[PDB]
From a paper:
The results show that the Pi trianion binds with an exceptionally strong femtomolar affinity in the absence of Ser102, show that its binding is destabilized by ≥108-fold by the Ser102 alkoxide, and provide direct evidence for ground state destabilization.
Previous studies showed that mutation of Arg166, which interacts with two of the phosphoryl oxygen atoms, reduces Pi binding affinity by ∼103-fold at pH 8.0 ( = 460 µM and  = 640 µM,;  = 0.5–1 µM,). The Pi binding geometry in the S102G/R166S AP double mutant, solved herein, is also indistinguishable from that in WT AP. Comparisons of X-ray crystal structures of AP with and without Ser102 reveal the same active site and Pi binding geometry upon removal of Ser102, suggesting that the destabilization does not result from a major structural rearrangement upon mutation of Ser102.
Author numbering:
A (entry chain A), B (entry chain B): 4 to 448
């Protein structure tokens, strides 16, 4: 069970065979990649919106066309999975999912309607993979660059009828069957605190300033409630670093931003005819992203350091969330940079799994998104931008699917990749619900 | 070695686990797909423009969201491959390839510039896989639904500086160094007639009416040259069925249309705000396609029959050409119908390979295209269309990347899948030029 140690172009891309990514026959190395033994641990990295177009754009920009991601591209067992949602009313396929339905699909193994967290079309709760791991005595972690109430982390720890039900105020008014004062389990935040994973790291500090409307902690802020229940609170990179354990007695909660955590790269918004009317853009670092905000990789390493102390095993989900968020924003530099943030975190996970030898690492996305790579001279009706790549060549990206100021998701099947025990369950055509069952079987749940 | 006999949804898509495509662990089934033994035959099926988006849109429409292509989705060993071209002047990546450069990349194993057939950026001729297979003593076939001078068939049999150089008339004017009356190898058609593949089936009849400017067949039509050299010429489905053998004495040449062969399904072109302003479309049969035109599946059937008499082995390429041609045209019914036509041919190929036991079948595209699956209510700046699927739900497709008649290719890496000996070399991230070297090492050339 190796990783792909290198799959860049092997020489001159203008000569015969110098664009090859393979040195020799792969049959031998693939046989050695196929193990059916238990997974002691699972690390699931999700790139929100990170379909094949978004993977290719970021490789082309940051590593060159012939380049190779030392995390993202290093996982040997690849396939394509479908992530279609359901219409709540009919029960038939909705071909473009949101993040709540898609994340619910892998977390719970049941399809659902757009905006649903941990509930089916019938609005009934199902147990998540995190919840099942915790019941089994495994350590758990939920890490995201987004608000911890974002669809992607919330799907592991909350069951609500709409994904907008962050805190009491919104839950009371949009998920009244889930609201705490109507006898429901609570808001996404209140449920997150009931879920009590060992490590929970991301943004979303703001909704912890809400007070509970009922229950044991009525009048307490949710920040105060977390502390009342014995959670360790950390707010920055130095405090995250200094935590020495995390468990059911001292569960860790890192709140690293008010909303979403700040993206690493800056560049202009793509504009109508923007590849024709602007100079090619080079991305810079984001000079508002303070140095004390931990990166996705730093959060991953600390999570692995704490979780790997449970001898029975652990389950860890890590989301590179603002890939999607910038793809909505039509901001190529932000998008590509957040794909780089995810590559770094994959490397940490893959490095871990090489050493430990019984960990299953899975890298995929929740759905496909808007950005396409198009020709230098393309006259498109949407938002475009020319970019200066590592190859010293112009790449143009287009966002062509909305007139309203959010570039929208797409329905294409997209890459899923895996390394370690049970990776075979990712090859060929699968559905996102199969991913729940893959993880279940590998952990012995 | 096993084929994926069924990977549809396994029950109620709304119930727990009823969207699953996997019935149990795949580790053992994937071990039994891995052989290092030599391939006696190869079938390379190319969907022109058939990216993951194109595949998903066609499955959604024709089989349903939880559906499954008995051909396209049945190949067990999957990955993603990169298909970037080069700028001719610089030798740097060009991120969106045409069909000529991409086909040249798998057919010769050297990257090239858009518009190039069988030549590098320096205009130097390189041998193709078809040419090599023949020289090694294996039978050869080249089947396409396009003109036999389209980039995809031409890159197996011609070495010209521009893909426009169809016959003498064009070659003298745009490829004056390859023109026959200047000491060149000839037009695309003239080089096809020289290459002398055992089976060649498609369209492009009209270029055979052009007459030659020099050489042995000066002053006779290219058609007459084909007759004088001992080709069996066939024009319809009845004539094709009547052929009993193909070989170097009697090579077969099927010319089934002036230009491209007619597409199977009809629909309206997508229009600005077409999902909002026009009714949901259901695809019908194409009235303009006589039953005398053989289908891609029928052409594949005959080619397999005639090539399989060579005990030493054969190489066959089959292109579903008009997936791309119609995706350019912003026509969901044309594109989807052609994707289904290709599925039928892939089925023929896998059925052959499962019984013969030493055949390597590969399905992929030359590049990705424009069509995106978007939300029912999308308000896009491009051309949209709502379609009534097999599920009984509306799917919308969007074409958002051009402002001219022709919608444009994209640069996203796309699915590549294989079955049979040496199919392991398709898994992970590969480049299009690796496909050349995979085939070459599979045949032992
Ligand atoms: Zn998402
Ligand atoms: Zn998310
Ligand atoms: Zn989104
Ligand atoms: Zn093409
Ligand atoms: Zn073609
Ligand atoms: Zn094309």
């Amino acid at each position: 069970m190796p990783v792909l140690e290198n799959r860049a172009a092997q020489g001159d891309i203008t000569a015969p065979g110098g664009a090859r990514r393979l040195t020799g026959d792969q049959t031998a190395a693939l046989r050695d990649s196929l193990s059916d033994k238990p997974a002691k641990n699972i690390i699931l990295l999700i790139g929100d919106g990170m379909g094949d177009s978004e993977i290719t754009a970021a490789r082309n920009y940051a590593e060159g066309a012939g380049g190779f991601f030392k995390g993202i591209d290093a996982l040997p067992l690849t396939g394509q999975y479908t992530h279609y949602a359901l219409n709540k009313k009919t029960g038939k396929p909705d071909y473009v999912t949101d993040g709540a339905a898609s994340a619910t699909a892998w977390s719970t193994g049941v399809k659902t309607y757009n905006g649903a967290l941990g509930v089916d079309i019938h609005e009934k709760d199902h147990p998540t993979i995190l919840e099942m791991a915790k019941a089994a005595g495994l350590a758990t972690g939920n890490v995201s660059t987004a608000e911890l109430q974002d669809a992607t982390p919330a799907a592991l720890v909350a069951h609500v009828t709409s994904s907008k039900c962050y805190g009491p105020s919104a839950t009371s008014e949009k998920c009244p069957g889930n609201a705490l004062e109507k006898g429901g389990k609570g808001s996404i935040t209140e449920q997150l605190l009931n879920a009590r994973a060992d490590v929970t790291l991301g943004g979303g500090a703001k909704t912890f300033a809400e007070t509970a409307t009922a229950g044991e902690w009525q009048g307490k802020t949710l920040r105060e409630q977390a502390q009342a229940r014995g959670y360790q609170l950390v707010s920055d990179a130095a405090s995250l670093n200094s935590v020495t354990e995390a468990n059911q007695q001292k569960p860790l909660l890192g709140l690293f931003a008010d909303g979403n955590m700040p993206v690493r790269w800056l560049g202009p918004k793509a504009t109508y005819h923007g590849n024709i009317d602007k100079p090619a853009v080079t991305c810079t670092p984001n000079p508002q992203r303070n140095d004390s905000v931990p990166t996705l990789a730093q959060m991953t390493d600390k999570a692995i350091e704490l979780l790997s102390k449970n001898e029975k095993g652990f389950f860890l989900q890590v989301e590179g969330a603002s890939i999607d968020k910038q793809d909505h924003a039509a901001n190529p530099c932000g998008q590509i940079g957040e794909t780089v943030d995810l590559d770094e975190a994959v490397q940490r996970a893959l490095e871990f799994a090489k050493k430990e030898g019984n960990t299953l690492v899975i890298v995929t996305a929740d759905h496909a998104h808007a950005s396409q790579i198009v020709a230098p001279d393309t006259k498109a009706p949407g938002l475009t931008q020319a970019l200066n790549t590592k190859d010293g060549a112009v790449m143009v990206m287009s966002y062509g699917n909305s007139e309203e100021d959010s570039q929208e998701h797409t329905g294409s099947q997209l890459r899923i990749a895996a390394y370690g025990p049970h990776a075979a369950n990712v090859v060929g055509l699968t559905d996102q619900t199969d991913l729940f069952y893959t993880m279940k079987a590998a952990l012995g749940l």
